Design a protein around this nucleic acid. Sequence first.
DNA 1: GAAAAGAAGCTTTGCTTAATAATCCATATGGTTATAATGGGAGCTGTCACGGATGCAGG
Length: 105
Amino acid sequence: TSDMEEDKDLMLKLLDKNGFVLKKVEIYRSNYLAILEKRTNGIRNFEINNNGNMRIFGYKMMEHHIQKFTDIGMSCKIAKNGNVYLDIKRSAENIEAVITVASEL
DNA sequence: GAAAAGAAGCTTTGCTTAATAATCCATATGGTTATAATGGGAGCTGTCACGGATGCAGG
């Protein structure tokens, strides 16, 4: 969707803004991937699904980071190896909120 | 005889997970300590009845 395009525009705007460099930005399963450079704060990528949900996924994230993203109301799915899903709705205010909580981790 | 409806048969896809890079950490191994530092310790103490093998000795 073009809303996913514009939310990609503000996403790269606020990740490029806040000094969080990217490994690669990928359209994969027709979904966006704002992948972090290193596994910083136990986080892998800042992805966008086309199903109205931008998602933050990681590997062995600390609990207090997860609490900081449930401050802005995000779902989580831990795995058996430390893989953690973080669901939020894809919107510009959620772009600003997720990248401003990620910008203070 | 039409028309909803449900399966056959394709696809994706979010999730998992097994293979593999990375790293770190137990582990071994050896070295190296330059004053001088000179014979242990529990041994049980209240069996016991037989018995055969030493063991010693004088004729």
